[PDB]
Amino acid sequence: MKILHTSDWHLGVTSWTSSRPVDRREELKKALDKVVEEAEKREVDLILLTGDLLHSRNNPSVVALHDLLDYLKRMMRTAPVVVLPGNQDWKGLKLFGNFVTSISSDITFVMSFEPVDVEAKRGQKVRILPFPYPDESEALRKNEGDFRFFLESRLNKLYEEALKKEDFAIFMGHFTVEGLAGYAGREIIINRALIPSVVDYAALGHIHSFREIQKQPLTIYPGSLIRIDFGEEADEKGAVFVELKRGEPPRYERIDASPLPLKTLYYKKIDTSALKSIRDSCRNFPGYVRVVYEEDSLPDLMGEIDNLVKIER
Amino acid sequence: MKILHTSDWHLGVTSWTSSRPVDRREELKKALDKVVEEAEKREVDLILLTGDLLHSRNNPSVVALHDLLDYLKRMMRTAPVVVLPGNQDWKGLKLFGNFVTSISSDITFVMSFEPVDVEAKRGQKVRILPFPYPDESEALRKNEGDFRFFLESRLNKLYEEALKKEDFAIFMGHFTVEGLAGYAGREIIINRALIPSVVDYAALGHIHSFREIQKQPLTIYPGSLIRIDFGEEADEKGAVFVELKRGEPPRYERIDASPLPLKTLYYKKIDTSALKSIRDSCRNFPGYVRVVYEEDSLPDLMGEIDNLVKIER
Ligand SMILES: [Mn+2]
Ligand SMILES: [Mn+2]
Ligand SMILES: [Mn+2]
Ligand SMILES: [Mn+2]
């Protein structure tokens, strides 16, 4: 069974609004078009979207919605799709996915801990074990003091249920795993060993950097399709194609999104030398630049350099 | 060759000072004593400390220094030690390590990109390829606009130098790798593929969660020995014992620090029910508790519950 797993699109995002608005819509469409064109070529059987498809939790734009629906539609033409909305998907979208989910067997939204069964392109019977974002807000809501005895009982249920799979069991989560603190300088974090060990694949979303979290069960974050801000100069962007065969270990292959790069320039004083360096370093750079400096002054660089998006102290 | 790799001790830390000071010194000594006692038992050949041994960058306490020196001394009695101070080690410590480094062949500090050679307990000839923290401050200092063409030239040098090893080449770094953003809601991050592939082991520090970053070359963060604040409820603490043999793939084994646990309780309103839940949930818990709630009021819980260290909204 062939799978396209992709995530964390953030449709409608514009970066650096406090300093120099760049609408990411063109770059983002470039990547999504590349991903979808790739999934058509490989003739995948199932498409897994693990959330944060939209960027605005409360006020998505019509353009953004139109886009998302366009893509959902192109994808459905190639294979059945399963969506696990995340923390930053507009609440209205969960309502629509709930409505469209009854109407079709070619798209299906999962918004609870309840497992659902689905058929893929070629009839493969797939069991979805979903784990939506553990929101601090819905732990205050539930008013159960220790939230963890509860998440743990859910991860147990999904394990008991994965054991009854017919063809494949696939876990879908939207959260952060016990990654890496302390980056300088809060979430309900889930330990990766807690993801049920018996599923054939564990598709994650929420993290923007592609990472192969563990091998048994195969657990991946595909990452964003673009670099959203400057904490993402060094990671990898794209989606992931996964193959599952009953007798065998899972195999996978990245589709790199080929995102525009980001770069930071560091200076003590903005000298005449610095000005030259900044001008020279931005001139032929195909992406976006931030400069940070230590000692004060300062000319209008952003009026002169189209790709200089941030200047700090 | 047998190695003890341990890191990120944070000697002298007291947690939750803004809300309920807990001096971590006792718990921390418990762990360090366990680690060192373990390294004596296994009779390791080399000890690698990858930085952030002290907690205070500018104002470490005498007690903290006394402690650090005690441990450095016990360790030297069992095997030669190599230290890569990190971002949060007091500047005075770098001065001392620089001074003590000439005087002895049983301890050696590495504070630049310059490789140094060392002998282990039993004569094994080891090549250290160090990579100290890429501080934003020392990139403003250097005043070289694009810092990355520079770090890259250094990682190249260390690779060219690892190829001339006699017995073992070992990389020591103090930084964050392209981990996982966006955790809700800056550093010079280094991509793990950039760590020279030819070294036999790559010892990292700065990250508090034990993680096996990659297998070839074997790259580990051992993690803290304690859980510093509440962003570390789910990760693992301890040190790492590593074995390297010329013909063979590297092998390793964690020493769990057995740290005191942390826990968050979530409530809508602090009711009479909540009060009961909080009281019941803290009563027999061997670690530290934080409660967060949504709607306002509120009694003196911290006067009544010794292990309740934080209350938010
Ligand atoms: Mn998310
Ligand atoms: Mn996201
Ligand atoms: Mn550090
Ligand atoms: Mn640290």
From Swiss-Prot, chains A, B:
Coiled coil: none annotated. GO terms for molecular function: 3'-5' exonuclease activity; DNA binding; DNA endonuclease activity; DNA exonuclease activity; metal ion binding. The active site is at Q88. Mn(2+) 1 binds at D8, H10, D52, H208. Its cofactor is Mn(2+). Its EC number is 3.1.-.-. Keywords: DNA recombination, DNA replication, Endonuclease, Exonuclease, Hydrolase, Metal-binding, Nuclease. Nuclease activity is regulated by Rad50. The mirin-derivative PFM39, specifically inhibits the 3'-5' exonuclease activity. The N-alkylated mirin-derivatives PFM03 and PFM01 specifically inhibit the endonuclease activity. Mn(2+) 2 binds at D8, D52, H174, H206. GO terms for biological process: DNA recombination; DNA repair; DNA replication; double-strand break repair. The keyword DNA damage does not apply. Belongs to the MRE11/RAD32 family. Homodimer. Forms a heterotetramer composed of two Mre11 subunits and two Rad50 subunits. Homodimerization facilitates DNA binding. Part of the Rad50/Mre11 complex, which is involved in the early steps of DNA double-strand break (DSB) repair. The complex may facilitate opening of the processed DNA ends to aid in the recruitment of HerA and NurA. Mre11 binds to DSB ends and has both double-stranded 3'-5' exonuclease activity and single-stranded endonuclease activity. This is DNA double-strand break repair protein Mre11. It comes from Thermotoga maritima (strain ATCC 43589 / DSM 3109 / JCM 10099 / NBRC 100826 / MSB8). The gene is mre11. The chain holds residues 7 to 325 of 385 of the full protein.
